[PDB]
Nucleic acid binder design. Structure first.
Ligand SMILES: Nc1ncnc2c1ncn2[C@@H]1O[C@H](COP(=O)(O)OP(=O)(O)OP(=O)(O)O)[C@@H](O)[C@H]1O
Ligand SMILES: [Zn+2]
Lengths: 121, 320, 74, 53
RNA sequence: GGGUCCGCCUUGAUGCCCGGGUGAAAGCAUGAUCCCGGGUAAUAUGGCGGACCCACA
């Protein structure tokens, strides 16, 4: 799998990330698409970044992992951009999503942010 | 399959005892990075969106260059091989304008046609084809290779003479098939001697390799980003000249017969030729005043009218 | 009259298409064997030796001429 | 865009898998470049990691 | 007087591209839409000057 994927993500944790997008979409606020996600990180609004693993060209989302690490924002990988798009509530694919306000998935984002920090190291 | 750039030419020997002096000249291999850039050509993979001229302007601005030029205009929506000659090499693109091109194209049919009929009709468009009806202007299609058919979509590779409009070719195929067709996607895979190989580079990798040179001191990546100007000349008939004739040509003299050491066969009067040193350096582009047989047999006369000089005057000493 | 050839089909973009063995000129008048006016040559394309000709029809129902042989009125 | 290419054998296709060797294909066109290149520094950190710089 | 190299001298019916903001029925989050900022329009020919040469190797 592509070189922008820094760490191996378990099947269960990827589902929890997609669940976190689904819930926060209608209960809180999310940014969907690479430009919106990147701005959210740049502005320090994103609490969690979700990046697809099937992005081609890779350069589209390649800047995100080192941007997230600079701005101290946790990130997670999901297998499919099509699946990530549907979770964001759009009919097309999404290369990356950002969560601004988790809403009801607040505890779910906490669980992800703690578990990705262990995968990072 | 094969473009006129692929068929090898015989090298005719005029002077068997012709020798080159290592004291003079800079062959591509021993050019310092700065000189390499000065006489360089980027084999660029153009992104769809910007014009070819915009992309060249981006390159000049980012690499801090005074001059640059591209070898055969790619339309804005079209991606692929775009030779970008730099600085002192800028004008070598003139050898690339009339060169044969290769494309991968996607044709979308406006009706349902059986696979056998698609292939048969497209096979008919190989050879000399009419690009403008009279009241006769023709263009050569060297090959059409149908890669796959997915319903109304036909993906194919096509090798063409310079000035062949692929959009037009597809429109005409659609008329010959009855149902109509349009070009939904185009990518250039070859522009003369430049093709999709290890040397093809994106703007992203180009600028990043430049940064690896300026900040990290690593020149190897940016060196590989740029080809010598001699590459832009690989498809042309060549005349190899003696050391004693090199400085004359770079000072404005036309090439006379007693200066020729080696030459390609098949050169006709009026042909664009590349004048080379015996170290395979590009000296000049010229118009042949003689045939290959004339150059080989004769002892006197102007063989090549020199049109564009690329080699600096001080590389070889004045020996005339 | 100089024979063009069989009408292969009526293209939906609005042209009768004929395969022939010579190169007609733009705006040449096109008739059938009985000299009845059919249309006008608007494009010549394909192989130089065996080109396709796009004929802009000037009759009400051009579809009836599919499979019929057309000529350039001279 | 839907023209794809096999990275290893160089086959042009519309399919997700290569019809020749049987591996995942990549889109044929290069990504959009910006002369402003706002995130080029972050791309380089990734690229230096990959190339071992 | 000429050639080569370089410098200088001319025009353009809102587009398109890139970016900042916004972020939505075949299109489309790998960016719709609109607002704003920038970039690029024919990579000639003719003319004037500067430098180097006038070359059969
Ligand atoms: N008969 C036609 N006349 C004009 N344009 C056409 C015609 N058929 C297809 N096209 C063009 O081809 C494009 C391809 O889109 P679309 O897939 O809807 O076409 P299609 O013929 O239905 O293809 P498919 O049947 O494979 O889905 C369309 O946007 C349309 O502009
Ligand atoms: Zn393959």
């Amino acid at each position: 799998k592509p070189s922008y994927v820094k760490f191996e993500v378990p099947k269960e944790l990827a589902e929890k990330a997609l669940q976190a997008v689904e819930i926060a979409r209608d209960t809180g606020k999310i940014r969907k698409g690479t430009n919106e996600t990147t701005k959210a990180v740049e502005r320090g609004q994103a609490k969690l970044v979700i990046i697809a693993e099937d992005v081609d060209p890779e350069e589209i989302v390649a800047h995100l992992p080192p941007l997230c690490e600079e701005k101290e924002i946790p990130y997670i990988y999901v297998p499919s951009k099509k699946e990530l798009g549907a979770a964001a509530g759009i009919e097309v694919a999404a290369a990356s999503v950002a969560i601004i306000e988790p809403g009801k998935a607040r505890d779910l984002v906490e669980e992800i942010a703690m578990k990705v920090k262990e995968l990072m190291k | 399959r094969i473009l006129p750039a692929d068929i090898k030419r015989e090298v005719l020997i005029k002077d068997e005892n012709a020798e080159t002096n290592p004291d003079w000249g800079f062959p591509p291999e021993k050019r310092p990075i700065e000189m390499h850039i000065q006489f360089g050509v980027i084999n660029l993979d153009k992104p769809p969106g910007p014009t070819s001229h915009e992309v060249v302007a981006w390159i000049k601005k980012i690499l801090n260059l005074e001059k640059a030029g591209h070898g055969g205009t790619l339309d804005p929506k079209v991606s692929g091989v775009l030779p970008v000659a730099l600085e002192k090499a800028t004008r070598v693109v003139q050898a690339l304008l009339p060169a044969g091109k290769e494309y991968v194209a996607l044709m979308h049919l406006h009706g349902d046609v059986p696979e056998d009929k698609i292939i048969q009709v497209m096979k008919e468009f190989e050879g000399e084809i009419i690009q403008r009806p009279p009241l006769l202007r023709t263009r050569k299609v060297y090959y059409i290779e149908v890669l796959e058919i997915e319903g109304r979509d036909v993906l194919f590779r096509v090798g063409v003479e310079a000035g062949t409009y692929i959009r037009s070719l597809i429109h005409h195929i659609g008329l010959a098939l009855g149902v109509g067709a349009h070009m939904s996607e185009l990518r250039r895979t070859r522009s003369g001697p430049f093709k999709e190989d290890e040397t093809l580079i994106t703007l992203h990798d180009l600028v990043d390799y430049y940064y690896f040179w300026k900040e990290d001191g690593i020149e190897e990546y940016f060196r590989k980003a740029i080809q010598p100007m001699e590459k832009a000349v690989e498809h042309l008939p060549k005349v190899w000249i003696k050391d004693s004739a090199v400085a004359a040509v770079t000072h404005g003299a036309d090439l006379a017969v007693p200066g020729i050491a080696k030459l390609h066969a098949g050169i006709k009067r009026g042909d664009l030729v590349a004048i080379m040193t015996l170290k395979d350096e590009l000296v000049a582009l010229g118009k042949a005043m003689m045939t290959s047989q004339e150059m080989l047999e004769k002892t006197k006369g102007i063989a090549v009218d020199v049109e564009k000089v690329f080699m600096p005057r001080d590389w070889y000493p004045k020996l005339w | 009259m100089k024979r063009l050839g069989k009408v292969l089909h009526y293209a939906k973009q609005g042209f009768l298409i004929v395969r022939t063995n010579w190169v007609p000129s733009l705006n040449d008048r096109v008739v059938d064997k009985r000299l009845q006016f059919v249309g006008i040559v608007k494009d010549v394309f394909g192989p130089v030796k065996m080109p396709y000709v796009a004929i802009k029809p000037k009759v009400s129902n051009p579809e009836i001429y599919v499979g019929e042989v057309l000529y350039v009125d001279e | 865009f839907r023209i794809r290419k096999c990275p290893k054998c160089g086959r042009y296709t519309l399919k997700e898998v290569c019809p020749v060797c049987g591996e995942k294909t990549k889109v044929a066109h290069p990504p959009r470049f910006s002369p402003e290149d706002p995130y080029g520094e972050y791309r380089r950190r990734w690229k230096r990691e990959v190339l071992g710089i």
